[PDB]
């Protein structure tokens, strides 16, 4: 199963931020609430917001921050890229051990979808090669965050800002820098063409070998370049030498050389599954990383 | 449309580690009682044919080591209720949520908090299969992991994990120790029955596809409960009941597609196949969303 991380450590950080008539979620860590800067927009500002002008007109008391039933007093504010940082007078007693990290396409994380500062659901995600997320976000979901948890340390990697016309989602890291070529502005924007994460499919095939299945193996091999020439005809990401190195330990563990597994994937794309499933799917799954597979 | 689990925090604060001799698993700590599978009192030899009454009479409180993180909880009483062991402990859990023990029906969904060594590892959303198994991911030491639903404030515990069947699917009990399915907590040959697809859930997920963008599968045709159920029997789909039709009413009202109309869509989807056409994204027809789930 594609598992999300247990969400408790993040649930204790979610709050509600309202400015004017706009309400969204904030992330309360220590004495700072992080939230998307378009909370300071009215709907007449969405098309062409001048955020520096909108923000200089705000005072601390314009920001209503609510953690459950308690209002938090905002005592300062600043803007870092596309996020607003609200200094509050109380440090969150539920702040976990945490860091901010920027992820790269192909990497996975869990999303805690929230509305009105209250958590609604959690699911596991991958950042697509085109820097979008295939999320489940509705109105009021901004400021929901993505995260990993390693040894009780929560690494925040994503904050939600918008939905693109194909139904996919775009946001920032926790320093307010967008993933991909998007802007927090309601103007015509489109996700680039989305490709399958090849190194993740290969890792997952290795996962199936470690488990019971071998039905999809074959006796062929391939050069790296012949693999890429074929796979790109199926909208698969090109496989780099870094990707090959990364699979090395799984190759070691199964005794199947990386380019032999590449030959298997080539044949799977050519043939489909013929009514079979790998692990539990009838799809070539690309939201498990090689790092995930060892764990 | 993602298959989302409930936020797990209220449950994470209840997970403890329970060790009896050389056997270690997970326990659920609520107020001053720890609940866990009774086979924790078994050696990896008792498991073959245990007499649980006998093994429990031979146990004392000092046979049970319970650990909530860094803290050892002192067991001051033990009893058994069906297939679960109840260890009364020194201390009430200060993190006990509002909670209820409930028994669910095949086809209903819940979230699982997978745990190892009393420590939560991950969370995911499940359905109780018609053959009463769970298609989970559970490894050695996962026993005592629980499944749950949350309504507002209240945690409804519905599943406790006990075993893995040879198909790689899973079987457990409700919180009162009653098994789901024709299984026993004994290491002997048992097998999952022939499974089926949860028809009312597929229909719900098609309504979600309509609510969302996808409408290609819609057609002018309709069917009967009787005609559909013989299509169902042929394809290992759970038979569709008049109660299923009724609870799909909200979605039939919301989208304008009557259930026997959507059944014609489902019937044709199960014969044309899907024509390399995708629905939400799935190649197959998803049956792990309830009508309730889709409404929410
Ligand atoms: C989809 C919409 C056409 C409305 C617009 N999209 C584009 O402008 C784009 F196409 F360019 F991306 C859009 O998302 N926004 C408009 C406006 C913000 C944002 C927004 O409303 N954010 C949400 C947070 N509570 C969550 C969204 C709502 C629906 N589902 C989500 O995830 C800003 C980009 C400042
Ligand atoms: C799979 C195994 C052959 C070991 C056996 N299965 C069957 O005996 C059956 F086929 F009959 F079901 C089985 O599960 N057990 C043997 C024995 C308990 C149990 C058990 O070890 N439970 C684990 C709890 N930590 C979780 C399991 C472990 C691996 N993955 C899981 O989920 C009892 C039924 C008393």
Indicate whether A167 and A252 sit together in one domain: no
CB contact under 8 A, A11 and B9: yes
Indicate whether A28 and A167 sit together in one domain: yes
In a domain, B61, yes or no: yes
**A243 in catalytic set:** no
Number of neighbouring beta carbons within 10 Å of residue A59: 8
Indicate whether B19 and B165 sit together in one domain: yes
Alpha carbon distances (Å) from A45 to A54, A80, A99: 9, 19, 32
CA A220 to CA B89: how far, in whole Å? 60
| Cα(A50) to centroid(ligand 1), Å | 17
CA A61 to CA A73: how far, in whole Å? 8
Helix axis angle, B259-272 to B225-234, nearest 10°? 30
Indicate whether A157 and A205 sit together in one domain: no
CA A30 to CA A11: how far, in whole Å? 14
CA B290 to CA B201: how far, in whole Å? 5
Indicate whether A23 and A153 sit together in one domain: yes
Residue B73: which of B60, B95, B94, B92 has the closest Cα? B92
* Residue finishing a domain among A157, A172, A187: A172
What's the per-residue H, E or C state across chain B?
A: CCCCECCCHHHHCCEEEEEECCEEEEEEEECCEEEEEHHHHCCCCHHHCCCHHHHHHCCCHHHEEEEECCEEECEEEEEEECCEEEEEECCCCCCCCCEEECCCCCCCEEEEEEEECCEEEEEEEEEECCCCCECCCCCCCCCCCEEEEEECCEEEEEEEEEEECCCCCEEEECCCCCECCCCCCCCCCCCCCCCCECHHHHHHHHHHHHHCCCCCCCCCCCCCHHHHHHHHHHCCECCCCHHHHHHCHHHHHHHCCCHHHHHHHHHHHHHHCCCCCCCCCCCCCCCCCCHHHHHC
CA B62 to CA A64: how far, in whole Å? 53
In a domain, B180, yes or no: no
**A38 in catalytic set:** yes
In a domain, A255, yes or no: yes
What is the total count of domains within chain B? Answer: 2
Indicate whether A111 and A150 sit together in one domain: yes
> Residue B122's domain spans which residues?
12-173
CB contact under 8 A, B6 and A280: no
Strand order of the sheet with strand A32-36? A70-72, A63-67, A14-19, A22-29, A32-36, A83-88, A74-80
Contact at 8 Å (CB) between A174 and A37?
no
Q: Report the first-to-last Cα separation within chain A, whole angstroms.
A: 13
CA B220 to CA B204: how far, in whole Å? 19
| Cα(A161) to centroid(ligand 1), Å | 7
Q: How far is CA A11 from the centre of its chain?
A: 17
A167: left (phi over 0), alpha (psi -120 to 50) or beta: left
In a domain, A191, yes or no: no
Indicate whether B129 and B30 sit together in one domain: yes
* Residues whose CB is less than 8 angstroms from the CB of residue B214 and which lie 6 or more positions away in sequence, other chains included: B279, B280
| Residues of chain B in Cβ contact (below 8 Å) with chain A | 1-10, 12-13, 113-114, 120-124, 135-137, 213, 281-284
Instruction: Quote the tokens at residue B26.
Output: 């997970």
CA A258 to CA A251: how far, in whole Å? 6
Indicate whether A85 and A230 sit together in one domain: no
Residues of chain B with Cβ-Cβ distance to A135 below 8 Å are 2
* Residues whose CB is less than 8 angstroms from the CB of residue B125 and which lie 6 or more positions away in sequence, other chains included: B3, B4, B5, B6, B109, B110, B111, B112, B288
For residue B288, the domain's CATH number is: 1.10.1840.10
A56, containing H or E segment: helix A51-56
Indicate whether B209 and B137 sit together in one domain: no
């Amino acid at each position: 199963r594609k598992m999300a991380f247990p969400s408790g450590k993040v649930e204790g950080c979610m709050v509600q931020v309202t400015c004017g008539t706009t309400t969204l979620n904030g992330l309360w860590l220590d004495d700072v609430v992080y939230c998307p800067r378009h909370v300071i927009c009215t709907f007449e500002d969405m098309l062409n917001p001048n955020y520096e002008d909108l923000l200089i007109r705000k005072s601390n008391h314009n920001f209503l921050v609510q953690a459950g039933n308690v209002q938090l007093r905002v005592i300062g504010h600043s803007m870092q890229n596309c996020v607003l940082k609200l200094k509050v007078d109380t440090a969150n007693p539920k702040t976990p051990k945490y860091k901010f990290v920027r992820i790269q396409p192909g990497q996975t994380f869990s999303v805690l979808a929230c509305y009105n500062g209250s958590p609604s659901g959690v699911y596991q995600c991958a950042m697509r090669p085109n820097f979008t997320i295939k999320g489940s976000f509705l109105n009021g979901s901004c400021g929901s965050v993505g995260f990993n948890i390693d040894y009780d340390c929560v690494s925040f990697c994503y904050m939600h800002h918008m939905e693109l016309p194909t139904g996919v989602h775009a946001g920032t890291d926790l320093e307010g820098n967008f993933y991909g070529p998007f802007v927090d502005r309601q103007t015509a924007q489109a996700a680039g063409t989305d490709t399958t994460i090849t190194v993740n499919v290969l890792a997952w095939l290795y996962a199936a070998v470690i488990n019971g299945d071998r039905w999809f193996l074959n006796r062929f091999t391939t050069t790296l370049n012949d693999f890429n020439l074929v796979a790109m005809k199926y909208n698969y990401e090109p496989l780099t030498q870094d990707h090959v190195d990364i699979l090395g330990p799984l190759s070691a563990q199964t005794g199947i050389a990386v380019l032999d597994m590449c030959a298997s994937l080539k044949e799977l794309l050519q043939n489909g599954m013929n009514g079979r499933t790998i692990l539990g799917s009838a799809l070539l799954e690309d939201e498990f990383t090689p790092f995930d597979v060892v764990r």
